Symmetry: C3
Subunit: 430 residues, 3 copies
């Protein structure tokens, strides 16, 4: 924990130094350095470098001006190595990849990718880290949803180091499943000599099962590089303080940070704020109800957002662009979880699914139809298992949100009770 | 379009002239002529004539008085032929039948008819035009719901011109189904030599399928004859202007019209207004949500209506009757559709049916159970097809309501979001 | 009716006299006598006596003091016999047992008992009178839920008077089922020579079926002894007036009564009030919606109650205890029913389960999926029967609540429309 916080704090400290360095190299003002569009281009450069460049936006003469700078990849690689105390440091690089993955997950529906791989486009909640490269870092493997893994494996199915790459990914997915039955099916997909349709079929089944018997996907709050750089510069020492991705740290960092974004004429700056907030806390596929309660303001579905992507294309013109503050703070904080919720146990039930009339009064007599009717080889075990589950079943018992003043997470608030971010479009009202 | 508007405008112009003529024949005042109960009796007469009569209500000495007039059928037939520029004109006659059908559909549940034919009384949404005679006009065929057709065909199943009548009706129903599978079943019902139980069974199946894979039923705004007559008299030329049943025209006509109704002591005049508004725009089986949004005031379920039928029986006494204005205007207008919504395509999905927990917080983890579990000869194709459909699936993409000032339907309003008119009674709370 | 009211009034009159007698024997003040915790201990004594005692709470020196008195069982038995005009009187004894049963049903979830017997812990609505002894009184048999009966029978399955005890209980349960099919299964469980697993399996099936095809369980408003005693003393004659358990009487009795309860520091006195109100009208497993409408204030789920049990354990200290008035009155009253609602008939349907689009507008097209899809040896009859039922189906047609001024129940109020009391806990959100 102390040791984990040590190295995590070491990599964020490295990202910070690099960004500051890069900001002076481009002679950007502090405000300009803290424009989300500038941070992404700088993030893109160091990721691409492992000549290159992209749009860098300057406040010039009361107007926003675009410029596509170019840097030698050898020079960037040097600047990254040296901001990270000599070492090559692939850790912070993958941390900035996961940040981009989270923003992608929050911005774009990847249905076109899903249908090509033979997957149902309603599996987006399984798709964390799908834009993240195949065989990324260990942290990248940790963060990838069940569907991402399944998608990657079918791309394979569609040179004996190909076999080990296949096996590694089978094992990654297996480690994500919380039931032995699902785990046993992955062994059957892995054990296959010369994989094909039966494996494809199996993986589609597993993906669908992961909608109810959800897998263990890690969630890591990853912030634009400018946030870390701004913190280092302002006097914060991530090596002395340590740092965490799943605890209070990132919430408390955003609470002391101010990030900006370029805003188009049609766009609501609050809606841009929601998007980058979601991305920051890897919350694209969270229940909107909890996202709201945590933030303090309503987290609206994608379809009701009066905004488009964070990045401003080379096509559109700068003379209409204004720049707004991003609202990334929260009312409460909550630990980020690796868990997919309850899947196992089935230790009794404890509840009520029908009523017994006491009074002679006209009314309907409510009962939980799917639950009552429900009770009337590894494939059928899974079927029976998800047939047993109910949307009403509670996970994370005893756990709750925390006040920002609660450093040590001592007094959990359990919240009382629109769930899907991608539920509202021209085809479906979910 | 111009040609369609020409003839439609010609038949409404004919109905108009006839009503004016009839109003002078009975020496009725303009107000009296625009009493819905008077219009229906005049409508009844010309329909029955193809001696006869019915109750005609006059404002006499500060009180409402009833009188059952009588006209020779030869004289009425002459008056109809001559108001329609010589010609026999069966078009306007069937237009006044469809108006009566729409009012019937809005007023009376026809469960007793449904059970005799072996049909489920919950199929009322399939029952448009069930009170309309068998083998009416082409417009009558167009307006009949899937269930009406099925009901008519079973009545048959329960003299070789009987065979062609059977075949015509099979083809009418077939032309209504939007899926080839349903269409293929109708061919199997039609092809049958000496039809019986298997056909009955097939038709019950098709009817049930039309609740999810809905058929193409035409909808035509048809107004009481007084509305058209009042318009002709006031200076409107339906031949010069043309006229439409599915566009803006009828909405804009009601906007410039004022209709009255006799009201009983218990009845709410607003609730009478809702009923005749629904009837007018053939909306008895529309979603209450859209009916409301269009009208601007809430369209309440049948069970919550403090009113009975428009027609006042010969039994009840006139001394308690008062007369109220009918409120038939709307906030918005919308094109009337022939479509039954989406049934085909299945081009991907694009949505979200489960959540992936990001935060360690106590809550249930919502998922779309029926949809996820769903994925686990022409009869089974249909079963699989309606098993694939979901209540959340969106039809009429891109289409919306219009401001009354928007003649050419240029700026569609897409509405944001109690659905069943016949959902609330002593047996069921739908 | 007059004869039934005669004897019922006779037993409540007996309970009343006994309580008054007991109150003087303990030299308690009227206020002290009307403390719910005192009444229960006195109720416990006469039930246990058929030496003994329990905690009796006195208001001493501005503080609440506890004392565990002791009485000879021979003396209590004498006091009960003599307050009941000589006779042994087992009737009032079982009436005080049913009162305790109702409070138990309202206070404690009995999942631990359910799981041992192999039953689903979600069957609590079937569990009326489970804490009531096996083979209680006839009134006790009447009041026991389907699940209680099933639980009792499995305890058996897990000395030929054992056979008759088995058969009596099979017949009790049978008399509760409203469908012949369920009744026929009980005959098959009863007819079994040397019962075992097949019977266990059968009874679990029947219990589950009783969640939809609900059985006839009697409900009797039974009040703490202090309420009856207080009434006798104040001048009310239950033999001259008669008395009822299912009519207006108990509501009207509570309306003229004032009961108290000891309250802990954390507890909301209103929430204590809800609990004892529910217990009093045997309403633990009623729909919360009707319980509310009747009472006039919201009847909250168990999980949202800031209270624990009525009885104060010997462990906890008296110096923190305060005493509050219990709010047991109601806005309306309603007859208590023996019925389990509709299970039979299936006389047509009359309703609407889908919509037919009239307007070309973007929206989803709602349909009742489970109902439409539903239509696609005694075990299968039951399956088909509960598959036919719907949560939306209305029972007790024409019946409603009454104003407290409406003695003869002349003007029924039919109510317009959270249902489960035990639906909210750390495992489930129902
Ligand atoms: C205690 O104050 C300081 C503390 C340190 C440095 C400067 C100050 C300081 N010097 O002047 C003022 C004024 C200051 C000040 O009050 N703050 C507010 C908090 N700030 C902040 C806090 C955190 N994390 C956590 O606090 C925790 C994480 C886990 C349990 S607590 C992170 N992060 O981990 O990323 C970033 C930032 Cl920027 C630092 C600046
Ligand atoms: C433009 O005005 C006139 C226009 C014509 C005649 C008189 C006037 C007129 N002369 O004086 C005043 C004052 C007038 C006036 O303003 N109105 C309001 C609209 N009225 C009306 C409009 C329609 N249809 C449509 O407008 C459309 C349908 C499709 C696109 S537009 C229908 N219908 O088709 O059944 C019935 C009626 Cl009654 C006619 C009278
Ligand atoms: C009519 O008044 C009296 C009537 C009798 C005795 C005294 C009074 C009386 N003497 O002075 C005042 C003042 C009085 C008074 O107004 N009440 C209110 C009602 N009280 C009461 C009413 C009932 N039942 C029913 O009323 C019905 C049950 C069914 C249809 S009506 C029950 N119960 O059956 O358990 C308990 C009680 Cl305590 C009795 C006292």
């Amino acid at each position: 924990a102390t040791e984990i916080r040590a190295s995590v704090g070491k990599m964020i400290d490295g990202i910070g130094r690099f960004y500051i360095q890069m900001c002076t190299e481009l002679k950007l003002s502090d405000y300009e350095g803290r424009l989300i569009q500038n941070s992404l281009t700088i993030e893109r450069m160091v990721l691409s470098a492992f000549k290159t460049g992209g749009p860098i936006y300057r406040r010039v003469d009361g107007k926003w001006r675009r410029e596509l700078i170019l840097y030698d990849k050898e020079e960037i690689r040097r600047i990254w190595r040296q901001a990270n105390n000599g070492d090559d440091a692939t850790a912070g690089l993958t941390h900035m990849m996961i940040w981009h993955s989270n923003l992608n997950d929050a911005t774009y529906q990847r249905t076109r990718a899903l249908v090509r791989t033979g997957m149902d486009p309603r599996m987006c909640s399984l798709m964390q880290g799908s834009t993240l490269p195949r065989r990324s870092g260990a942290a990248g493997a940790a963060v990838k949803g069940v569907g991402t893994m399944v998608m990657e494996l079918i791309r394979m199915i569609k040179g004996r180091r190909t076999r080990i790459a296949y096996e590694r990914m089978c094992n990654i997915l297996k480690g994500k499943f919380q039931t032995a039955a699902q785990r046993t099916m992955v062994d059957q997909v892995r054990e296959s000599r010369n994989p094909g349709n039966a494996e494809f079929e199996d993986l589609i089944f597993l993906a669908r099962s992961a909608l109810i018997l959800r897998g263990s996907v890690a969630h890591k709050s990853c912030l634009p590089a400018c946030v870390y750089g701004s913190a280092v510069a302002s006097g914060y020492d991530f090596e002395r303080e340590g740092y965490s991705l799943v605890g209070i740290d990132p919430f408390r960092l955003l609470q002391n940070s101010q990030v900006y974004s370029l805003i188009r004429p049609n766009e609501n700056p609050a809606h841009k704020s929601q998007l980058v907030w979601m991305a920051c806390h890897s919350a694209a596929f969270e229940d909107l109800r909890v996202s709201s309660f945590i933030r303090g303001t309503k987290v609206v579905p994608r379809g009701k957002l009066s905004t488009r992507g964070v990045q401003i294309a080379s096509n559109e013109n700068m003379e209409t662009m204004e720049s707004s503050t991003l609202e990334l703070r929260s009312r409460y904080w909550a630990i980020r979880t690796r868990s997919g919720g309850n899947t196992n146990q089935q230790r009794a039930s404890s509840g009520q699914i029908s009523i017994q009339p006491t009074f002679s009064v006209q009314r309907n007599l409510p009962f939980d139809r799917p639950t009552i009717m429900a009770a009337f080889d590894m494939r059928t075990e899974i079927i029976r298992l998800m047939e047993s589950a109910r949307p009403e079943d509670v996970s994370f018992q005893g756990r709750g949100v925390f006040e920002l003043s609660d450093e040590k997470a001592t007094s959990p608030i359990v919240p009382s009770f629109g769930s899907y971010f991608f539920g509202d479009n021209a085809e479906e009202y979910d």
